[PDB]
């Protein structure tokens, strides 16, 4: 806290959807103590062994003969660190990995797979600390979430359908900050996915609801978008102090 | 930040500038100097630009487009095709080749835009380099009319012939390593 | 819109990206205040 540098404290862009922008203490700890957003989840950790076995089965020749070769072998498959080889086809590998994430065979919902198309690296991180949030999945310009899923969730009790079934169906997906860097998001399905003057026609995900970017204390603020930003921080601090 | 941009020059203000003044720090964050012009140069923009050029530090790196080192065995050989003409001209009445000539050639090529912006002259640059370094560096300069501004630098003629050194016949820093050292020194320290 | 301009008024209500960017600006102001206090206090003590 003693350090007066105003770099580590500032609200970074990557905090979107994962740390509350409003809720921070004021004083020596401005921006240094943060609070999770409402829908944020923190990875618990997993063994990388099944992913490595899948990669070995697909291709990912390791101990190759200087095959990167100006990255002719597109992408270098990384894991939690540990360059484990490279593949000639990166897009087929990425699609197969996403399908496996849906079928929940080798990839738990938490496993995070990032391909950097330029620089040609795929990172595949499962390291027990990543903070991720649920985002709906957009195929073409249509959300995968449909009336069947919403109707079954509406009957949630005595229908034995829950969020985990929504994840298993492939409707929703957990995306961490590294994957948030490689994903085109839509705030709302109707306003953005639908055909208009085309800003983007390659949306890959959709926010479940924007208001979830706020934390617990800032979520009680009514009409927070109509207040000045420091006032929402003040209300977070004061709502931690209200008597009830 | 939020300082009004009257001019395109940043200035420390506020608490940090008060700290600098109060501490009498030897290194200000933004040391600046306001210069007023005495004569008609204040009224006329071209003379003011001349003063600006005289007051602004210019290294050879700022006006150099690209530098190359070619091993040229003979001056008449002209390994680079382009210099074959002007080298010939300079070697129609060769000067300082009596001792010897260096087998290595530093063929610096200057950007015309930077040269004309700073209003530098090929004779000016050549004089600075040759005089400051001494007779050791011999420079051949192109005509400004030529499309490429080329300065051909060679190591000491007497040092190449080794009659002047006498002592022991042992290469010091070879020649190409010495030429690279010379190139770095010219790039960052010419102060044209 | 991409780089932060907020065209909606407070009465109209900020859109989500405008809301996050406004939060970024407010955070910068708060950090400035908190950092300012200590440096100014040291300066004042030295002068006195």
């Amino acid at each position: 806290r003693d350090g007066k540098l105003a770099k580590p404290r500032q609200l970074h862009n990557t905090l979107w959807g994962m740390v509350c922008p409003a809720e921070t203490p004021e004083g020596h700890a401005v921006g240094l103590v943060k609070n999770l957003a409402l829908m944020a989840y923190i990875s618990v950790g997993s063994q990388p062994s099944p992913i490595l076995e899948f990669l070995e089965e697909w291709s990912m020749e390791n101990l190759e003969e200087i095959s990167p070769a100006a990255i002719a072998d597109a992408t270098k498959i990384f894991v939690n660190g540990c360059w484990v080889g490279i593949h000639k086809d990166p897009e087929q590998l990425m699609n197969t990995l996403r399908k496996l994430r849906r079928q929940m065979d080798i990839i738990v919902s938490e496993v995070s797979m990032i391909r950097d198309i330029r620089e040609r690296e795929i990172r595949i991180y499962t390291d027990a600390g990543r903070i991720c949030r649920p985002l709906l999945i957009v195929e073409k310009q249509k959300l995968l979430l449909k009336k069947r899923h919403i109707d079954q969730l509406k009957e949630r009790e005595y229908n034995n359908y829950s969020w985990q079934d929504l994840v298993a169906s492939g409707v929703v997906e957990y995306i961490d900050t590294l994957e948030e860097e490689t994903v085109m998001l839509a705030m709302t399905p109707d306003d953005l996915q639908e055909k208009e003057v085309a800003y983007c026609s390659t949306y890959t995900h959709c926010e479940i609801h924007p208001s979830m970017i706020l934390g617990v204390c800032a979520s009680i603020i009514p009409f927070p978008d109509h207040n000045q930003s420091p006032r929402n921080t003040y209300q977070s601090a004061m709502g931690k102090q209200a008597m009830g | 930040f939020h300082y009004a941009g009257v001019s395109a020059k940043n200035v420390t203000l506020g608490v940090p500038r008060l700290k600098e003044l109060i501490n009498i720090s030897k290194k200000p964050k933004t040391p600046s100097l306001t210069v007023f012009l005495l004569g008609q140069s204040a009224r006329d923009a071209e003379r003011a630009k001349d003063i600006l050029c005289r007051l602004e530090h210019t290294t050879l790196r700022k006006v150099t487009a690209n530098t190359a080192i070619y091993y040229d065995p003979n001056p008449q050989s002209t390994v680079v095709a382009e210099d074959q003409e002007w080298v010939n001209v300079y070697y129609e009445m060769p000067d300082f080749d009596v001792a010897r000539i260096s087998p290595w050639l530093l063929r610096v090529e200057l950007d015309r835009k930077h040269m004309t912006d700073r209003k530098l002259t090929m004779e000016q640059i050549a004089e600075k380099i040759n005089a400051g370094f001494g007779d050791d560096l011999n420079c051949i300069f192109n005509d400004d009319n030529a499309e490429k501004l080329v300065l051909r630098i060679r190591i000491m003629n007497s040092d190449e012939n080794k009659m002047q050194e006498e002592e022991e016949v042992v290469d010091k820093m070879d020649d190409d390593v010495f030429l690279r050292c010379i190139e770095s020194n010219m790039l960052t320290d010419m102060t044209l | 819109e991409s780089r932060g301009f907020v065209e909606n008024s407070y009465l109209a209500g900020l859109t989500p990206t405008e809301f996050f960017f406004h939060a970024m600006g407010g955070r910068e102001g708060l950090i400035d205040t908190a950092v300012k206090t200590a440096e100014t206090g040291y300066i004042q003590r030295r002068l006195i």
Binding site: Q228 | H2 | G25, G26, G29, D32
Partner: peptide, 8 residues
């Protein structure tokens, strides 16, 4: 939060 010349 206003502009570049104002406040954040």
């Amino acid at each position: 939060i206003w502009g570049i010349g104002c406040n954040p």
